[PDB]
Scaffold this motif. Structure first.
Motif, PDB file in Angstrom:
ATOM      1  N   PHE A  32       3.102   0.158   3.201  1.00  0.00           N
ATOM      2  CA  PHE A  32       2.543  -0.770   4.164  1.00  0.00           C
ATOM      3  C   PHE A  32       2.190  -2.014   3.474  1.00  0.00           C
ATOM      4  O   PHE A  32       2.020  -2.031   2.241  1.00  0.00           O
ATOM      5  CB  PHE A  32       1.369  -0.151   4.853  1.00  0.00           C
ATOM      6  CG  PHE A  32       1.716   1.166   5.497  1.00  0.00           C
ATOM      7  CD1 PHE A  32       2.468   1.202   6.695  1.00  0.00           C
ATOM      8  CD2 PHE A  32       1.401   2.377   4.843  1.00  0.00           C
ATOM      9  CE1 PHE A  32       2.823   2.446   7.287  1.00  0.00           C
ATOM     10  CE2 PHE A  32       1.773   3.643   5.422  1.00  0.00           C
ATOM     11  CZ  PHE A  32       2.470   3.672   6.635  1.00  0.00           C
ATOM     12  N   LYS A  40      -0.658  -4.926   3.649  1.00  0.00           N
ATOM     13  CA  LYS A  40      -1.985  -5.137   4.233  1.00  0.00           C
ATOM     14  C   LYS A  40      -2.705  -6.212   3.468  1.00  0.00           C
ATOM     15  O   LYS A  40      -2.282  -6.558   2.389  1.00  0.00           O
ATOM     16  CB  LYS A  40      -2.791  -3.818   4.139  1.00  0.00           C
ATOM     17  CG  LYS A  40      -2.266  -2.709   5.055  1.00  0.00           C
ATOM     18  CD  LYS A  40      -2.244  -3.097   6.605  1.00  0.00           C
ATOM     19  CE  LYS A  40      -2.155  -1.832   7.473  1.00  0.00           C
ATOM     20  NZ  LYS A  40      -2.266  -2.205   8.956  1.00  0.00           N
ATOM     21  N   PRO A  87       0.012   4.955   0.242  1.00  0.00           N
ATOM     22  CA  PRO A  87      -1.185   5.725   0.477  1.00  0.00           C
ATOM     23  C   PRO A  87      -1.004   7.212   0.165  1.00  0.00           C
ATOM     24  O   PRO A  87      -1.961   7.902   0.162  1.00  0.00           O
ATOM     25  CB  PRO A  87      -1.456   5.548   1.989  1.00  0.00           C
ATOM     26  CG  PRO A  87      -0.148   5.219   2.621  1.00  0.00           C
ATOM     27  CD  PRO A  87       0.725   4.571   1.491  1.00  0.00           C
ATOM     28  N   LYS A  88       0.202   7.697  -0.122  1.00  0.00           N
ATOM     29  CA  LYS A  88       0.321   9.110  -0.466  1.00  0.00           C
ATOM     30  C   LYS A  88       1.362   9.358  -1.514  1.00  0.00           C
ATOM     31  O   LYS A  88       2.333   8.623  -1.655  1.00  0.00           O
ATOM     32  CB  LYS A  88       0.648   9.977   0.761  1.00  0.00           C
ATOM     33  CG  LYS A  88       1.902   9.631   1.463  1.00  0.00           C
ATOM     34  CD  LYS A  88       2.283  10.743   2.458  1.00  0.00           C
ATOM     35  CE  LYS A  88       1.164  11.094   3.389  1.00  0.00           C
ATOM     36  NZ  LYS A  88       1.110  12.582   3.595  1.00  0.00           N
ATOM     37  N   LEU A  97      -7.208  -5.944  -1.271  1.00  0.00           N
ATOM     38  CA  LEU A  97      -8.559  -5.418  -1.404  1.00  0.00           C
ATOM     39  C   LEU A  97      -9.395  -6.168  -2.440  1.00  0.00           C
ATOM     40  O   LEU A  97     -10.616  -6.105  -2.346  1.00  0.00           O
ATOM     41  CB  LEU A  97      -8.516  -3.962  -1.796  1.00  0.00           C
ATOM     42  CG  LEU A  97      -7.957  -2.968  -0.790  1.00  0.00           C
ATOM     43  CD1 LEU A  97      -8.051  -1.567  -1.440  1.00  0.00           C
ATOM     44  CD2 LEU A  97      -8.802  -3.026   0.402  1.00  0.00           C
ATOM     45  N   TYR A 119      -4.385  -1.030  -7.946  1.00  0.00           N
ATOM     46  CA  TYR A 119      -5.647  -0.270  -7.687  1.00  0.00           C
ATOM     47  C   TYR A 119      -5.280   1.158  -7.328  1.00  0.00           C
ATOM     48  O   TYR A 119      -4.554   1.384  -6.337  1.00  0.00           O
ATOM     49  CB  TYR A 119      -6.452  -0.978  -6.546  1.00  0.00           C
ATOM     50  CG  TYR A 119      -7.845  -0.418  -6.320  1.00  0.00           C
ATOM     51  CD1 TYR A 119      -8.555   0.225  -7.345  1.00  0.00           C
ATOM     52  CD2 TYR A 119      -8.461  -0.574  -5.073  1.00  0.00           C
ATOM     53  CE1 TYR A 119      -9.804   0.707  -7.147  1.00  0.00           C
ATOM     54  CE2 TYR A 119      -9.742  -0.116  -4.836  1.00  0.00           C
ATOM     55  CZ  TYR A 119     -10.410   0.560  -5.849  1.00  0.00           C
ATOM     56  OH  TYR A 119     -11.689   0.991  -5.600  1.00  0.00           O
ATOM     57  N   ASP A 177      -2.584   0.590  -4.329  1.00  0.00           N
ATOM     58  CA  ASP A 177      -2.097  -0.755  -3.863  1.00  0.00           C
ATOM     59  C   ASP A 177      -1.564  -1.478  -5.075  1.00  0.00           C
ATOM     60  O   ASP A 177      -2.092  -1.319  -6.194  1.00  0.00           O
ATOM     61  CB  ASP A 177      -3.273  -1.632  -3.357  1.00  0.00           C
ATOM     62  CG  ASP A 177      -3.780  -1.281  -1.908  1.00  0.00           C
ATOM     63  OD1 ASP A 177      -3.642  -0.115  -1.461  1.00  0.00           O
ATOM     64  OD2 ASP A 177      -4.385  -2.198  -1.259  1.00  0.00           O
ATOM     65  N   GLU A 235       7.244   5.334   2.886  1.00  0.00           N
ATOM     66  CA  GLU A 235       5.894   5.082   3.411  1.00  0.00           C
ATOM     67  C   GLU A 235       5.140   4.089   2.543  1.00  0.00           C
ATOM     68  O   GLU A 235       4.423   4.486   1.605  1.00  0.00           O
ATOM     69  CB  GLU A 235       5.106   6.367   3.521  1.00  0.00           C
ATOM     70  CG  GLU A 235       4.694   6.679   4.978  1.00  0.00           C
ATOM     71  CD  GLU A 235       3.895   8.015   5.118  1.00  0.00           C
ATOM     72  OE1 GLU A 235       4.512   9.134   4.944  1.00  0.00           O
ATOM     73  OE2 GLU A 235       2.673   7.933   5.454  1.00  0.00           O
ATOM     74  N   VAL A 292       0.827  -1.201   0.000  1.00  0.00           N
ATOM     75  CA  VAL A 292       0.000   0.000   0.000  1.00  0.00           C
ATOM     76  C   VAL A 292       0.887   1.287   0.000  1.00  0.00           C
ATOM     77  O   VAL A 292       1.788   1.454   0.908  1.00  0.00           O
ATOM     78  CB  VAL A 292      -0.918   0.008   1.246  1.00  0.00           C
ATOM     79  CG1 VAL A 292      -1.755   1.303   1.336  1.00  0.00           C
ATOM     80  CG2 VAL A 292      -1.813  -1.311   1.387  1.00  0.00           C
ATOM     81  N   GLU A 303      -6.684   5.599  -7.996  1.00  0.00           N
ATOM     82  CA  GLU A 303      -7.631   6.603  -8.525  1.00  0.00           C
ATOM     83  C   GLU A 303      -6.909   7.662  -9.353  1.00  0.00           C
ATOM     84  O   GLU A 303      -7.527   8.642  -9.712  1.00  0.00           O
ATOM     85  CB  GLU A 303      -8.294   7.389  -7.398  1.00  0.00           C
ATOM     86  CG  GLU A 303      -9.351   6.657  -6.694  1.00  0.00           C
ATOM     87  CD  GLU A 303     -10.085   7.545  -5.651  1.00  0.00           C
ATOM     88  OE1 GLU A 303      -9.639   8.709  -5.317  1.00  0.00           O
ATOM     89  OE2 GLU A 303     -11.096   7.028  -5.158  1.00  0.00           O
TER      90      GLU A 303
END
Ligand SMILES: [Ca+2]
Ligand SMILES: [Ca+2]
Ligand SMILES: [Ca+2]
Ligand SMILES: [Ca+2]
Ligand SMILES: [Ca+2]
Ligand SMILES: [Ca+2]
Ligand SMILES: [Ca+2]
Ligand SMILES: [Ca+2]
Ligand SMILES: [Ca+2]
Ligand SMILES: [Ca+2]
Ligand SMILES: [Zn+2]
Lengths: 206, 206, 206, 206, 206
Positions: free
Chosen positions: B199, B201, B12-13, B204, B40, B155, B197, B10, B42
């Motif tokens: 992760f 996880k 995330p930013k 999804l 995945y 992700d 950064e 992941v 956007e």
């Protein structure tokens, strides 16, 4: 402690005085949470509204799930907001689960059992546990200062909260139906107070 | 060394510092390959981003799978690019498989188990074995010179690579997730290093 | 004399030199025929292209299946043309069957197992026995004079030809993948010569 | 009388000389009827065409089923017309049943087994029993005076006619081709005369 | 007192004189009710029309279910209207159920067994028991003052009514075809008077 299984709260028209206050066993501050719930409104192409409003004595928007017209879902923790944009509105009841984890800042947002992308929010923060938790209105102070232009018009139910992040398999259970035991707010053992024009009815969704 | 089954990375930013470096037992230079992965994001209607960056000291874009804004998928072998235009963005996890064979120059690009037409790229070329393989950033040098405006935010997982071209029947097995073992990069026995950064996880997508 | 089962001819680039010539074991004047084939190209919104070209020494367009940009399928026998207009392009492999009978002039054109309306062309005409049958290019002379701007770029396979009109039940069986026995050209006993940049690969369609 | 099961009449090009006359063993005038048939044409966006033309000495449009370009289906009894407008044309074979009952004036029109709303036409009228029934052309007199710009180009078959109104359950069986016994025109015992360029071929619809 | 099972009323043409008036011995004023019915019309994109009109001497629109062109369903209790907007018309039979409760003012409207949002109308009001209940026309006085421009053209049937709010599982039972017993109006024991062009025919819906 009341079992609200198969029943939802109905706010049949706009007001700034109709709300439900949900009581959580207050505790140490939260390092993570998940909130899942069902709601059903026609307000989505018209205006914005609050879906779930959690405030502390010092932060009105300690956790806030909100619908913003012309944008989509709005998710805020400790005053900081993130957006999950929605290009087409649904004309049908909606299930949401959303989660936040301090250690990573990761937020997940699940709509009808389908995940949005993971985003980042308030990494390192702690969510206070002296809370006022409100359905049907958006808090601007601890337990109050509501705006009718952000009130929820329609049904909300199956509100459950946990103090940890649910896995995708657990979300699928909540969405499709099966056994689970929330440790912050449990719909099947709910302590609440109603105020103003709010009714308790059989839920409209399966 | 780690079975990453059911897990994803992941990012995330947006950043130019977050990435994962994948380690291949690579020895023999490549006259053919297949890369498959799930991702995945956007970002697609906002900007371009790198999906899979394979770099050598002679060629930073030795194998590059990229999304070009308002065009579609970009596929680069040894610095030369071919486009697979996409008229409409899908905002949902996507499975891709891409392959190239030096002998014919034939490239294949498969999206969610459906093939694009075969195209031609770099007939006769040989891809370098001494590689830096990066997820989350595009390399402009061996293992570095990243640009935040090309980072993947979202992700990525089920990354697998072989040193030959998978057949249509084999692609289908990968897509439906039947048994296979890749011989260059194996998600079920992955060696990797994480920086910045990112992760790990639960995935999804199913 | 080759079983091409489950393989296709791939023409990965525009050119006027890459083609396949198919040999019938034959020479009998044709009073009827059926031609079926699968093809897959992404050219359809950009320009026209030849799909199947049958020429005699008197007539370069003796049987011609052609895609004409902004119109759809063009079908010609003995140099006379009929059109089967197509409002929206399919970007996916297509299966086609087309037939013609001298006695009635009836033409059928079936796309993905679905029939277009019956039309009329060249009633009373005889199609010549000694032919040059070409895939990948459009012939302007017997066996040559190709035009690069009308080249097929993509895959073509499952080409079969009969000397009589297939019934709708027989076409349905060919489409659905049942048993059949072509008496002019048989993809399972195909005699052919390849020229230029043409490859033989596992087919992309089921 | 011949059994035309699984066969259809084919009118491959525009003319004013090609038609089929169907022979009914009629005696007493009709106080109700149902006509069902299948047809397939690509004309629907460029011109109108006659589907089923039933004429008497005193009335050329005694029963007329017709397609009006830019409108949809046109249904006439005893020279008086009703429309069943169609917003978007289907480009595929269609099955229609249509019925009229003099006692109510009620008209039904079924398209691919789905009923349009019931409408009203010619309550208390009686339909003449000495008839000229033509396929392929629109009659302006008893058995002639055809207009080429109104001719059917395409296929028609499964033509059946009863002297009473079929029930919704019975139409469902006629759409499903379960068993039925028409008493006016029976496609399985058809007596007919052909003129001009009309062919009998196996039906294109399943 | 007639068993209308499997039949519907048909209003084949626009008029201001065709209508059905439903009779039952109602004594007690209504503090809640549900009405359900099937209807089918092609009027929806042309003009508005009345579906079920319940008038008292005091109020012509005491309960009115109505369709308003370019808007959607209109539901009225005691002269107070709420809308249930429908941007895309269903050109097919439709089943509707609608309910109101005085104690809360909550109204429900269900279309093909799926619920709209709950809305609010006439909290604390009582619906009078001396009524004129009309199908086919909209009332502007107790039993009359019909307007042809609001007439129903099409079929209506399976009309039932109860003096309490059906729960969601009870609506399911009605929509899905389970045995039920209504306590105000009963399609299986329907007493009524008819005037003008109204016919009884087998229903077009399942
Ligand atoms: Ca606030
Ligand atoms: Ca506020
Ligand atoms: Ca680069
Ligand atoms: Ca770069
Ligand atoms: Ca040419
Ligand atoms: Ca030519
Ligand atoms: Ca006429
Ligand atoms: Ca005429
Ligand atoms: Ca009124
Ligand atoms: Ca009125
Ligand atoms: Zn649920």
């Amino acid at each position: 402690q009341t079992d609200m299984s198969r029943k939802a709260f109905v706010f049949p028209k706009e007001s700034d005085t109709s709300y439900v206050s949900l009581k959580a066993p207050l505790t140490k501050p939260l390092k993570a949470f998940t909130v899942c719930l069902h709601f059903y409104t026609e307000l989505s192409s018209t205006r914005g509204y609050s879906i779930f409003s959690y405030a502390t004595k010092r932060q009105d928007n300690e956790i806030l799930i909100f619908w913003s017209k012309d944008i989509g879902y709005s998710f805020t923790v400790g005053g900081s907001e993130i957006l999950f944009e929605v290009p087409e509105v649904t004309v049908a009841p909606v299930h949401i689960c959303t989660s936040w984890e301090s250690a990573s800042g990761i937020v997940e947002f699940w709509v009808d059992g389908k995940p949005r992308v993971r985003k980042s929010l308030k990494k390192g923060y702690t969510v206070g546990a002296e809370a006022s938790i409100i359905l049907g209105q958006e808090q601007d102070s601890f337990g109050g200062n509501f705006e009718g232009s952000q009130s929820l018009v329609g049904d909300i139910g199956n509100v459950n909260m946990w103090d940890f992040v649910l896995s995708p398999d657990e979300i699928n259970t909540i969405y499709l139906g099966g056994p689970f035991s929330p440790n912050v707010l449990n719909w099947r053992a709910l302590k609440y107070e109603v105020q103003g024009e709010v009714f308790t009815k059989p839920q409209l969704w399966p």
